[PDB]
Amino acid sequence: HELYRRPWIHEPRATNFFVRLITSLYALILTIISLVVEVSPTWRTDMWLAETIFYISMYGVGILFFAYCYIFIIYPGPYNQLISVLRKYKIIFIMQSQHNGEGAGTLYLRLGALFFGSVGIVLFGLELFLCIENVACKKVAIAKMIVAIVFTFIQMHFIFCNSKITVNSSRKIVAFGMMHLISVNLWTWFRFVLAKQEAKAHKKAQLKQTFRKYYSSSASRLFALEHFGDVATFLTTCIVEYSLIGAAIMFILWKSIGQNMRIDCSSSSTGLFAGIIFLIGSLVSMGMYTIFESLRNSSGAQLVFGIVDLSLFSIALGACIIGLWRMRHLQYRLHAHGEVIDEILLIIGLIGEILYCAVGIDVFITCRRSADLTVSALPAFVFVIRMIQVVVQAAFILTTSRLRCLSKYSMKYKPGKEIITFLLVSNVTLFVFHTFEGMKSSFGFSSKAATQYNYIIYAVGPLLVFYRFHSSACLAEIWKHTYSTK
Amino acid sequence: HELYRRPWIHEPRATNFFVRLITSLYALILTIISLVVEVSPTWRTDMWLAETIFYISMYGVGILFFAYCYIFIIYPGPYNQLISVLRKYKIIFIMQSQHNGEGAGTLYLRLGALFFGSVGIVLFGLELFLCIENVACKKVAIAKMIVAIVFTFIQMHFIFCNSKITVNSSRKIVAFGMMHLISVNLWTWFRFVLAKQEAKAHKKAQLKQTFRKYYSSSASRLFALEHFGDVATFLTTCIVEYSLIGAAIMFILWKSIGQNMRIDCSSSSTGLFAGIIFLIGSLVSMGMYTIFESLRNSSGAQLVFGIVDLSLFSIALGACIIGLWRMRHLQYRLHAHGEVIDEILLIIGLIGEILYCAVGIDVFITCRRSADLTVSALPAFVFVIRMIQVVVQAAFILTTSRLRCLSKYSMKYKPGKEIITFLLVSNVTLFVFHTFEGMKSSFGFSSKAATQYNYIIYAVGPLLVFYRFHSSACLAEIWKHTYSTK
């Protein structure tokens, strides 16, 4: 006939789309089945053998795909040596390195993946220790923890070294493996957010009892959650953040299938000093709350401590507003210069933060209704300011990540760079502050003043996201890209 | 300096992206807050005034935006007349029609939106009748139902007549309104899927009791759900499907902001006859199960009835397989020729169908464990075949929607057109069959044979999606586009 009149099976675009679609559908089926299995209560108690087989199978297929990659794509050296020996005096195909430079994720994202994977492996090892010291747990728990640790470590190495992967080899096998890795990461994320939700009920009940005794008369489970205090909450949010990052990186790698300067610390001083002041204030607040039992029990102090949190969030929000106003002078990007991975992860962190704040606000009101509204509304104000701050900061981060300093005025004068530096430092301090807040109720709020000024006790919902880490990574990318010479 | 060195506030692309981002964030915040409010148990019981205010506010802002559109964009006639009178002898700006032809959604999608919106308005009117006959309900329920009906009717008209909307007018106002409409539609969808989940617990408990008595010794709530039997389930899935379609249409309209043949029934006979045979078999099965109490109580019959369902799903799956094999000869699309709206809705229906089937399989096993595995595994096989059929059909629909008949052989001979016609007819019959299945447990499974062959009783989970309607719409689009002369 004419050109482009061949069967779609021979068309590279059509068959690439078909493999893409098949792998995506397979992932979707696995993720839905994993969610159904995890929620189901008859799979953790009765069908323990089936649940163990599913767990071992998910991690084992992940490890098999990782081994296939390391042997046949990333490091085909030993395979080439074996194939040469076979040809020498055994039998009578060779692979090539073909190393690439497709760095999918940002360096900050991969470093965070390393840190969170290490913390998750620490959590897995702690479970393993608990199940070793326990007789209730059996040999299958040992295998589950070991295979989880092995998969997590191998995926840490794969994520960090995701540039030397040449996905154009074994395209369909790599697509299926990437989708299985996404399914495994999402299944781990769902497992550990269901585990995090178990502590929500206990915290809620404890809060209701503590509230009542002070205002009266006017299906996944990890043993460390309820054994190692509230540190297990930090470990579990670390592992869910690691799983989210890994799933995003694997999705970027899977999407790439089939598709053919120096630190400029200039104009980063006034913001850096303000960021250091923010860090010093946050650290002083954390230390005063932690080491001084007298301070955490007084009402003056608990008022001042809550005012400190409100001031921190208000200062961050005002910094974002001033940054938008100053950076209004910048220029839009001439062409794309980023991966949607960072935006997607930041939006997921934003969703988690808004959910956390809304649940806290709902619990706060609930509690105030049960006490005839005798509680100061400062915790509600802190929650609302936190939600407004995270929303405005997400908008600011996206807008300024799509901004550049192209004009001569925007080059000699850097509008907002001080604000960007301050926001990056303050986001690191808010990350460590939110880590501390997960252990604030470990001290014990025996202070009646804590029931009327401290807002952490009202946040019984789990914090499933590290929005501050993703915000810091995006802000560092903005700082190093938006204010660059080009 | 040079070109493209102006502030991003003046850059049309940058400010369009900024308005897009702000409206998307606003929608996200509203949807998260709506989900938190609906799940919260203290908003339906204690904070009834706050819940009513939120309900009325969401629907009222939707209606205000709709009125603004109808007055100032779609039908600016009366506004022009008023503005002319003002200029005549009152004061001393005119709007223009600027009607467009941007048909966002498919005709089948808009017709389904009309049908489902009508059914949802019927459900709202039934509630209104119940609350009128009830003294427990107060005047606020009247207002809630009335405003829901008004919003649903206006959005029906807006969705059907979404071509004459010129979104390029009042770009930012229309963006905010489209995002508020998406938030309202998602909030309605979440409300009614939470309502559908309430019947899940009752059905599960009833199934456990009925199973036990036959094998012993070897936060949203709608009053019609538990009052009008299982017809309320059909009405509620109709309203959730309408809300999903409306949200998708509004998203397409919002995405369009800022961006500057005859029926060929040839070669559609053998498939049409097979589709008619499929319809006749399905209707005979439905009638025999409905009108004959003797048949629905016998074991021979209940076995044969389940075998009929298995045969229907197996025939549909085999039709999809044969269609892929035959249409392998077709040609890939030269360029895009569809809106992601249909693909997104089909994938959501697929997710819902897989969730339904997986929950049914989980319940089936659970039940068999409680009876020492004395139940035939036919219901599990039916569920598995249904899930496989829907997955394979989704893959087939997407692949063949990205296919064309460009070669001369693919023109004179139409590969798969018979299969496409048969699949469309059989999907209409499976739609009516799944509608019937929602009323199959209304008869009452007093037949012990129903507890061992009929698989509907094990599907205690709600069917939240009309996957068959979306499949029929996509298949009709394929039939009218893939096998066209061009």
Residue numbers in the entry:
A (entry chain A), B (entry chain B): 47 to 138, 145 to 270, 303 to 344, 358 to 583
Give sentences copied directly from the paper behind this entry:
At high pH, the CeOTOP8 inter-barrel interface adopts an intriguing structure. The Glu325 side chain points down towards the intracellular side whereas the His567 imidazole ring adopts two alternative conformations. The His567 side chain flips up toward the extracellular side in its major conformation, forming a salt bridge with Glu325. This structure likely represents a transient state in which the protonated Glu325 is transferring its proton to His567. Firstly, TM12 of CeOTOP8 forms a bent helix at low pH with a kink at a highly conserved proline (Pro559) residue, whereas the N-terminal part of the TM12 helix before Pro559 unwinds to a loop at high pH. Thus, this structural transition appears to be prerequisite for the formation of the proton-transferring bridge between Glu325 and His567.
The otopetrin (OTOP) proteins were recently characterized as extracellular proton-activated proton channels. Several recent OTOP channel structures demonstrated that the channels form a dimer with each subunit adopting a double-barrel architecture. In this study, we performed structural and functional characterization of the Caenorhabditis elegans OTOP8 (CeOTOP8) and mouse OTOP2 (mOTOP2) and illuminated a set of conformational changes related to the proton-conducting process in OTOP.
